[PDB]
Amino acid sequence: QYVAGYKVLPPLMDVNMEAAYTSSLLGSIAGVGWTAGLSSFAAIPFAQS
Amino acid sequence: IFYRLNGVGITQQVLSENQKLIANKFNQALGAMQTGFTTTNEAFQKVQD
Numbered sequence: 007q008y009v010a011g012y013k014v015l016p017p018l019m020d021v022n023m024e025a026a027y028t029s030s031l032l033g034s035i036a037g038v039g040w041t042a043g044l045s046s047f048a049a050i051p052f053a054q055s
Numbered sequence: 056i057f058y059r060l061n062g063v064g065i066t067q068q069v070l071s072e073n074q075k076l077i078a079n080k081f082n083q084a085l086g087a088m089q090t091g092f093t094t095t096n097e098a099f100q101k102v103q104d
Contacts, residue, residue: 043064 056081 007013019027037049057070060077070077092099 041064045064 033049034047036052036055037047038044039055040048040050060070061067088096094100
């Protein structure tokens with residue numbers, strides 16, 4: 007990093023943050039995908055989805 | 056506007072009973088950006104950019 011001189015910036019999202027966001031997507035794919043209209047949440051058991 | 060709101064999963068009954076409140080909310084929303092033009096608008100910043 008310094009034998010030439012440059013710094014690698016870490017990303018804005020931390021590892022726990024992608025973990026939480028992907029967890030939210032994995033929990034919400036069953037919910038949103040039942041009928042159009044994103045206002046409600048419809049977290050059906052998955053096999054029914 | 057009534058038909059478009061009907062299409063997104065809102066029943067006719069609340070539309071037929073609450074015309075004035077949704078009209079006032081629409082007026083407030085379409086007046087919000089009139090006083091909104093400052094640095095906080097991302098689109099305004101991109102136009103300036």
